[PDB]
Amino acid sequence: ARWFPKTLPCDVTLDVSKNHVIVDCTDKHLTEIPGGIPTNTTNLTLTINHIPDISPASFHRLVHLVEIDFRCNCVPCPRRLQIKPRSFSGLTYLKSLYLDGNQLLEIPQGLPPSLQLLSLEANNIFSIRKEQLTELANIEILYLGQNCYYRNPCYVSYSIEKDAFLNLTKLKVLSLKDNNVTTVPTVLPSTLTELYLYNNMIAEIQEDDFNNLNQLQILDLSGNCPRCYNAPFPCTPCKNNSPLQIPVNAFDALTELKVLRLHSNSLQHVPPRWFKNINNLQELDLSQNFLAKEIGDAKFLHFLPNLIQLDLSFNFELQVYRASMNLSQAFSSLKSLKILRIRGYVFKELKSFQLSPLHNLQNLEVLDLGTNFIKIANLSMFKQFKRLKVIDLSVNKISPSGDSCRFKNKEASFTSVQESCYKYGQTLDLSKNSIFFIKSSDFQHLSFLKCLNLSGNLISQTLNGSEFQPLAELRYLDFSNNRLDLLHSTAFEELRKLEVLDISSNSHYFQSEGITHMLNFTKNLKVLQKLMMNDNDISSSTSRTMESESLRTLEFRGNHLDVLWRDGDNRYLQLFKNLLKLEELDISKNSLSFLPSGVFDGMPPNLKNLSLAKNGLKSFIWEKLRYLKNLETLDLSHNQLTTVPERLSNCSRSLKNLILKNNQIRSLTKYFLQDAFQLRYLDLSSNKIQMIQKTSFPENVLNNLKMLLLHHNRFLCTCDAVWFVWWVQHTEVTIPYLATDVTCVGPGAHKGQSVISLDLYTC
């Protein structure tokens, strides 16, 4: 509630339905908590700052607070944060509290009984006692990880007294990652659901370690006795490179377990007895181990019928280069398997019969096989994997056939990189491979491919319309980081159903001058929608115009359009005129010092998104914008403009997203925003503007403005801008960083003063 604040430098978000008020003071360099904080707020953000300590009077009048965040307030900085006694007892409605990165020595006392979450990561608490945990009898989620490890050493092994967590009957999630823990803290409460003991120094597991945990769902034991070969981070192998000793009858009481992580445990064998009782396991991680021989046997896979995810990445043997992948026949028992990763299983040749166990997996979607240094791989063997969604053929050497400060979620699963080409259907990610030329015979029996990534292959070829013949249903093609010779306009002609084409980073042949550059090759593409050819350094073009009846988006950044539009050369003025359906242009970083007269007349009639960022436009004309009757998102950021148009209404009748970020403008015209009621977005940040007059900023236009930025510039706070001073502190226009970034240059003592906090009584 309370809607209107007075001088708070933190953003306020109101949710009437949720009855939640959010205050975000992230990255504000506040030495002390600012005054005037509303009593109706629910979430308080007090992240990285210069707060010396915490006082009971800080939250004296705040009784509705339900979330306090104090993450990374002192990253190892002055002395450690000190908390006065009874500093949290007054928050009866408190439910969540974060104290990560505060260099605390012991668990704070006096916490309210209503607390449900407590985070104490990146601290110096290496001792756990029941006396300090007595007050936390109603806690549900506990985060005590990253207290003693290589980044934040403490030189003392973690000590937990007997039955420390036993009386925490409400505990559900416990994390002890990177805490130098040697022994699992028995006895954990029976209500635990997620346990995170990974990246510790645990060497053995007892048979009664998880005897009472029946509701556990997620168990993590990574980093115990890890595989330290070629590790880019400090780690200590266990002795004799022994594996993490886990008894056969260890996961017996676990019946609701769903996620089990054993990554980087130096395991050599996986007994089937482990998975005898856990019949509902969904995700299993076994990466960074020594299970190369176990993959050939994989006898334990017969006890996982409901498995969804299986990770076996980077299990290669030392000084061993396998001739082929030895997949066990027990892989056919993974009926519900969806994602499979066999990376780091480096081998020479991949054959069709080696993937036979995966032929009957109906629910399999993703097959990851990248980073395996595969030399010989017949692509026609994938004709049986039509139901697969993503097939990974990454940096391995396949060649053509011959003749705590952020992330409030804390413990979260690894989110897979959702590439832009996955949404189009079947994907064959052949990026960074050893393919140096394209044959139509190689891609035979692959008409089902809706996607094909070939970035980084460094292919030097002159396509004439026959290489991608079998790819009849291809919709997305990636050809970045290659050497494409556009000597013919018939390239990609046989890709009838292609929609998006990426030929970026092909600067090699485009840099050479005097050779033909057929830029009209998009005419044959009937259903092409997006074309990305940026960072190509295109300086000449044999074709006068580019023709396309369906292209809508075109990226032409990082090229040389100045030479194409050189003074006295009108050949390429109407280069984009024939693109009738084009709606977005991205001609940026083209070293365009100036725009010759006539280019705007040659722009497509349906242009709607024009960008000229980072170009260096010394003088950009504005009366020529009348030609563009559909322009809405003109962008001139990071340019060297110096003059605003006399009347924006006379320039464009539809511009609504004008941007002039990081420009050099010292003053605005007296009628800059006169009768411009169609404008919605305006940006003038990072400029050299001095003052704004009333006649240039009418309130009628400013009322409908969604967002306006005037931060990080050189406004002068003198008596000549009383109207501006009154308006900035009495309007509802959303101006970000109003009290943090925009300051006053002068005069004299007014350096660094906040405009919204200015009250010139003498004026």
Ligand X SMILES: *[C@@H]1O[C@H](CO)[C@@H](O[C@@H]2O[C@H](CO)[C@@H](O)[C@H](O)[C@H]2NC(C)=O)[C@H](O)[C@H]1NC(C)=O
Ligand Y SMILES: *[C@@H]1O[C@H](CO)[C@@H](O[C@@H]2O[C@H](CO)[C@@H](O[C@@H]3O[C@H](CO)[C@@H](O)[C@H](O)[C@@H]3O)[C@H](O)[C@H]2NC(C)=O)[C@H](O)[C@H]1NC(C)=O
Ligand Z SMILES: *[C@@H]1O[C@H](CO)[C@@H](O[C@@H]2O[C@H](CO)[C@@H](O[C@@H]3O[C@H](CO[C@H]4O[C@H](CO)[C@@H](O)[C@H](O)[C@@H]4O)[C@@H](O)[C@H](O)[C@@H]3O)[C@H](O)[C@H]2NC(C)=O)[C@H](O)[C@H]1NC(C)=O
Ligand U SMILES: *[C@@H]1O[C@H](CO)[C@@H](O)[C@H](O)[C@H]1NC(C)=O
Burial class (CB in 10 A: 0-12, 13-18, 19+), 115: buried
Quick check: 411 binds ligand Y (CB under 6 A)?
no
Q: Which of residues 304-323 bind ligand X (CB under 6 A)?
A: 318-319
Q: Evaluate whether 603 touches 577 at the Cβ level (below 8 Å).
A: yes
Quick check: 464 binds ligand X (CB under 6 A)?
yes
Q: Evaluate whether 707 touches 685 at the Cβ level (below 8 Å).
A: no
d(CA 478, CA 548): 19
Q: Which of residues 14-73 bind ligand X (CB under 6 A)?
A: none
Q: What string marks each residue from 177 to 196 as x (binds ligand Y by CB under 6 A) or -?
A: ---x----------------
Taking contact as CB under 8 A, which single stretch among the options 202-210, 284-292, 320-328, 550-558 is the one that binds a second copy? 320-328
User: Has 403 been labeled as part of a binding site?
Assistant: no
Place of tokens 């009322």: 703
User: Has 373 been labeled as part of a binding site?
Assistant: yes
Residue whose C-alpha is closest to residue 246's, from 286, 279, 215: 286
Quick check: 43 binds ligand Z (CB under 6 A)?
yes
Quick check: 750 binds ligand Z (CB under 6 A)?
no
Applying CB under 6 A, among 7, 420, 511, 597 the residue interacting with ligand Y is 420
Q: Which lies closer to ligand Z via its Cβ, residue 93 or residue 321?
A: 93
User: Has 88 been labeled as part of a binding site?
Assistant: no
Q: Evaluate whether 327 touches 312 at the Cβ level (below 8 Å).
A: no
d(CA 108, CA 104): 8
Q: Which lies closer to ligand U via its Cβ, residue 277 or residue 633?
A: 633
Would you tell me which residues interact with ligand U (CB under 6 A)?
A: 608-609, 632-633, 647, 650
How many residues in total does the chain contain? Answer: 763
Quick check: 523 binds ligand X (CB under 6 A)?
yes
Q: Which lies closer to ligand Y via its Cβ, residue 45 or residue 453?
A: 453
Residue whose C-alpha is closest to residue 564's, from 531, 597, 592: 592
SS3 readout for 91-156: CCCCCEEECCCCCCCCCCCCCCCCCCEEECCCCCCCEECHHHHHHHCCCCEEECCCCCCCCCCCCC
Give 685's strand partners. none
Q: Which lies closer to ligand U via its Cβ, residue 38 or residue 645?
A: 645
Q: Which lies closer to ligand Y via its Cβ, residue 453 or residue 588?
A: 453
For residue 279, the partner it binds in ligand Z, ligand U, ligand X, none, with Cβ less than 5 to 8 A by kind, is: none
Quick check: 76 binds ligand Y (CB under 6 A)?
no
d(CA 378, CA 353): 11
Applying CB under 8 A, among 1, 137, 231, 527 the residue interacting with a second copy is 231
DSSP letters for 634-661? -B-TT-------S-HHHH-SS--EEE-T
Taking contact as CB under 8 A, which single stretch among the options 161-169, 195-203, 264-272, 505-513 is the one that binds a second copy? 505-513
Give 54's strand partners. 83
d(CA 52, CA 32): 8
Quick check: 157 binds ligand X (CB under 6 A)?
no
Quick check: 271 binds ligand X (CB under 6 A)?
no
For residue 95, the partner it binds in ligand Y, a second copy, ligand Z, none, with Cβ less than 5 to 8 A by kind, is: ligand Z
For residue 22, the partner it binds in a second copy, ligand Y, ligand Z, none, with Cβ less than 5 to 8 A by kind, is: ligand Z
| Closest distance to ligand U from the beta carbon of 611 (Å) | 8
β-strands 194-196, 173-175 pairing: parallel
Q: Evaluate whether 523 touches 552 at the Cβ level (below 8 Å).
A: no
d(CA 58, CA 550): 61
Quick check: 348 binds a second copy (CB under 8 A)?
yes
Quick check: 150 binds ligand Y (CB under 6 A)?
yes
Taking contact as CB under 8 A, which single stretch among the options 20-28, 291-299, 429-437, 580-588 is the one that binds a second copy? 429-437
Applying CB under 6 A, among 23, 59, 67, 147 the residue interacting with ligand Z is 67
> N- to C-terminal Cα distance for the chain?
34
Q: Evaluate whether 2 touches 27 at the Cβ level (below 8 Å).
A: no
Copy the structure tokens of residue 602. 């040659």
Copy the structure tokens of residue 403. 């003749």
Q: Evaluate whether 565 touches 592 at the Cβ level (below 8 Å).
A: yes
Quick check: 460 binds ligand X (CB under 6 A)?
no
Applying CB under 8 A, among 373, 424, 671, 737 the residue interacting with a second copy is 373
Applying CB under 6 A, among 78, 153, 296, 598 the residue interacting with ligand X is 296
For residue 485, the partner it binds in ligand X, a second copy, ligand Z, none, with Cβ less than 5 to 8 A by kind, is: a second copy
Quick check: 543 binds ligand X (CB under 6 A)?
yes
Q: Which of residues 116-135 bind ligand Z (CB under 6 A)?
A: 116
Q: Is the dihedral of CA 739, 745, 746, 748 positive or negative?
A: positive
| Closest distance to ligand Z from the beta carbon of 102 (Å) | 19
For residue 157, the partner it binds in ligand Z, ligand Y, a second copy, none, with Cβ less than 5 to 8 A by kind, is: ligand Y
| Closest distance to a second copy from the beta carbon of 375 (Å) | 5
Q: Is the peptide bond before 187 cis (omega within 30 degrees of 0)?
A: yes
Q: What angle do CA 169, 173, 177 make, to 5 degrees?
A: 130
Q: Which of residues 459-518 bind ligand Y (CB under 6 A)?
A: 478
Place of tokens 């998009």: 522
Residues 6+ apart with CB under 8 A from 511: 537, 539
Strands annotated E in 131-225: 141-143, 159-160, 173-175, 194-196, 218-220
Quick check: 170 binds ligand Z (CB under 6 A)?
no
Q: Which lies closer to ligand Y via its Cβ, residue 169 or residue 420?
A: 420
Residue whose C-alpha is closest to residue 656's, from 587, 706, 612: 706
What single letter denotes the amino acid at residue 298? Answer: A
For residue 43, the partner it binds in ligand X, ligand U, ligand Z, none, with Cβ less than 5 to 8 A by kind, is: ligand Z
- Tell me which residues touch ligand Y (CB under 6 A): 148-150, 153-155, 157, 180, 419-421, 429, 431-432, 453, 455-456, 478
Residue ranges for the known binding site for Ca(2+) are 759
- Tell me which residues touch ligand Z (CB under 6 A): 20, 22, 42-43, 66-67, 95-96, 116, 409
Residue ranges for the known binding site for guanosine are 373, 397, 485, 516
Residue ranges for the known binding site are 373, 397, 485, 516, 759
- Tell me which residues touch ligand X (CB under 6 A): 293, 296-297, 318-319, 326, 378, 380, 401, 464-466, 489, 518, 520, 523-524, 542-543
- Tell me which residues touch a second copy (CB under 8 A): 150, 229-234, 319-323, 346-348, 373, 375-376, 397, 399-403, 434, 436-437, 439, 460-462, 485, 508-509, 512, 514-515
